[PDB]
Design a protein around this ligand. Structure first.
Ligand code: NAG
Lengths: 49, 43
């Protein structure tokens, strides 16, 4: 779940994924069109009363 | 079959530096290999 944005990461042609240090997927490759998408989590935060 | 091509200055020995070997082709063969040989092109 997230926001798929355009990316300027220079993927090698044999690389499909990019990984965060917490082993979560940061970038993905579209299997239909050879493009790279950045995954960013949606807007969230804390609420104080 | 990891591969890399690198320019060299002269022909004494291996240079000093880090050339990362990118993967090139993966083969699904899966046979028993214990010995190997290299051909030469003789004219
Ligand atoms: C699948 O889509 C890609 C890009 O749209 C296209 O190049 C490819 O030919 C398609 N494959 C088939 C079997 O139609």
């Amino acid at each position: 779940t997230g926001v798929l944005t355009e990316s300027n990461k220079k993927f090698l042609p044999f690389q499909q994924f990019g990984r965060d240090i917490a082993d979560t997927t940061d970038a993905v490759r579209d299997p239909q069109t050879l493009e790279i998408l950045d995954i960013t989590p949606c807007s969230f935060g804390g609420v104080s009363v | 079959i990891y591969s890399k091509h690198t320019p060299i200055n002269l022909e004494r020995d291996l240079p000093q530096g880090f050339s990362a070997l990118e993967p090139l082709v993966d083969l699904p063969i899966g046979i028993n290999i214990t010995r190997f040989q290299t051909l030469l092109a003789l004219h």
